[model samples]
Target: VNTIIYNVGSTTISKYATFLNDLRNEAKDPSLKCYGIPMLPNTNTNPKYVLVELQGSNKKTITLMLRRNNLYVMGYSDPFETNKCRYHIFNDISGTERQDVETTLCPNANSRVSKNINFDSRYPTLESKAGVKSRSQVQLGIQILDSNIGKISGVMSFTEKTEAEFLLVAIQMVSEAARFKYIENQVKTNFNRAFNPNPKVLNLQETWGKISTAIHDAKNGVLPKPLELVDASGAKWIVLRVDEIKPDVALLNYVGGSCQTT
Candidate 1:
């Protein structure tokens, strides 16, 4: 609740204020549309991708993904050697080799997080702002305005030690929400297949029951941790921090995620 305005240097104050104001007004159903980016592309398209440039000199262009209502900083675009952008799309192509690849890259693509840290609907609690009471839920929020402006300005909940921790929670909340959404879509497809005409002699009810249990567990916050993978070069990619922010443009570090080495 203790908010800090991110205006530092030559940032256009008008745009920054307007963006924050819009975000606050639409906090009920916050969407990335404020940043002026298009909705997620159809995975069926030939090349699945979008570009995101951060604010800085010698900054690499990173891949931005919108899946299940959350934005993800997948990784940096390697110079034609190996593009990491191809791996993180929220494709609903059921039962295919490509599907397996996505499944391995993003294991928790179908899991629900509790309201305490849910990004689906975020709002500052009264006690959270007062700094007297602290528990789960989003205790802090960041408002990044001006997608194309350098040293983007906005607001951040003021605190000392818990700032980064809560910020990560905010990001992870969106991640979890997006994951749950993919699972929902995956389940919907499975159901459609179950009721398909001239279906195979599969145990349809049993399959449904199994998936139902998974969904139930996910609803209760039971889900697998993120997938871990080390590329051939022993290099792991992760969305390290909020590298840059703009109205519709954003960036995150790409050193690695969870799958490091021993």
Candidate 2:
């Protein structure tokens, strides 16, 4: 049997019009702006909804949200399951932007902040922000890893998450090695300034001394006393042969030995 229907009611027509208007407004929402399509367009161009894919809620669900020039992706384990982990990755679409990823295991129940990794594509570096409080000098360490072909892998470990937490001694040592580079540059700057005939009555020792003290305090004796600072040049030696490693009126040298880079 075939069924026939007449014209829709006036109420139905008004509701249909409202629905169309709502759809139009939703299309205009800036928050829904996304990337790509026309796949090979110009370097800088806004993309329309030529690519929209729906992600289902499986054992792991990933949701993507756009806010202004930033895109955030949030992932979580099944809501019905116990001991779920949550992950969030953020990327800035603008030219001057960085990417950051963070994960929390067993969120809210014996929770642990697994990793808060950040990447600065401009300079090609990955910084992992982990450890208790995540703000102490020792807690924060800069990582310099090796990249071969297309693979990049780096490893860092700590002893039992009790003393020093995520900030391993090796981590601090590498960070100190990098800072020592900066100290060398500062020394070079002072040396050049001293040679300048038009010197500006600089208290060169004051700056270096402060930096020396800061490094000592931050490392907390991880750096040895009477440290022999070795530079690239073999002829000149700026050795610190003193009790307190202070360069109040002289140059202090604290070079890194057995520097680890991998």
Candidate 3:
């Protein structure tokens, strides 16, 4: 990996070193204790809902949400206000009709990424650093770093190109590994394929296909109004779409199994 660190004038050698260290740290998993994914409001709350920060800032706290694993960064816009096109994250809430617009600065993504995400020249088979490129904005940008910092939304200018994309992957990988254990496992699986001393081949076709199928099969399959499910013991359940309550399962058994008794 190669990164031609920009002299943002005041950026210190330590700053560049920090960026490199973070990228290298990418190879190791540290204690992910406060990595923003709040499993429960209290230590033991039922109806597990993840408390994710939609937005925040150092001194100013704002925008918390109880959302599903459903997340994506997509382009949004006002039909009449053509100039309003930009990237926004579905913070699991409607940003209108009771949703207020918010912009914060505490996380100061620019600061975190100023040196981290940039242009780079490619190395043969190892990691590649990013240099400056045409600017692109990321949604929920670094939202996983909540406990350590606050979130803020605003404009970001970038010098964009292709090779510089390693930062994008790095940020997402770090965030993904920290968000959910399943994702961490997937990351580890990929990492092993890529870097394990006894390297294993990664069949992207099969890998992506499996997750894509799971996402498909696991999605509400053409809601038959009277949604139905049969557990392992042939106990049928009339599924309810209560978005609030969860663990709506397809099949299950407690560590101490269950019977068809209420």
Which has the greatest TM-score? 3
Worst 10 residues of 3 by lDDT: 71-80
Question: TM-score for each prediction?
Answer: 0.21, 0.18, 0.23
Q: Show pairs that collide, candidate 2.
A: none
Q: Please give the RMSD to the true structure for each candidate, in Å.
A: 22.2, 25.5, 16.8
On the 0 to 100 scale, the lDDT of residue 15 in model 3 is: 45
Tens digits of lDDT, candidate 3, 86-122: 2222323344411221122112232322112222222
Which pairs clash inside model 1? 35-247, 35-248, 116-137, 146-247, 147-246, 147-247, 237-256, 237-257, 238-256, 238-257
How many angstroms is residue 142 displaced in model 2 relative to the true structure, after the best TM-score fit? 38
* Whole-structure CA lDDT of model 1: 0.25
Off by over 4 Å in 3: 1-69, 73-156, 160-182, 186-262
Worst 10 residues of 2 by lDDT: 144-153
Tens-digit per-residue lDDT, 1-262, candidate 1:
1111223122343433443343222221222221221222223432232222222222322122222212332221112123222232222223453344343333344431111111211213323432433223222111221211212111112242233233333232233222223222222343222221111111211122232222222312332222222222335422111111111122111111221111
Q: Compared to the true structure, candidate 2 yields what TM-score?
A: 0.18
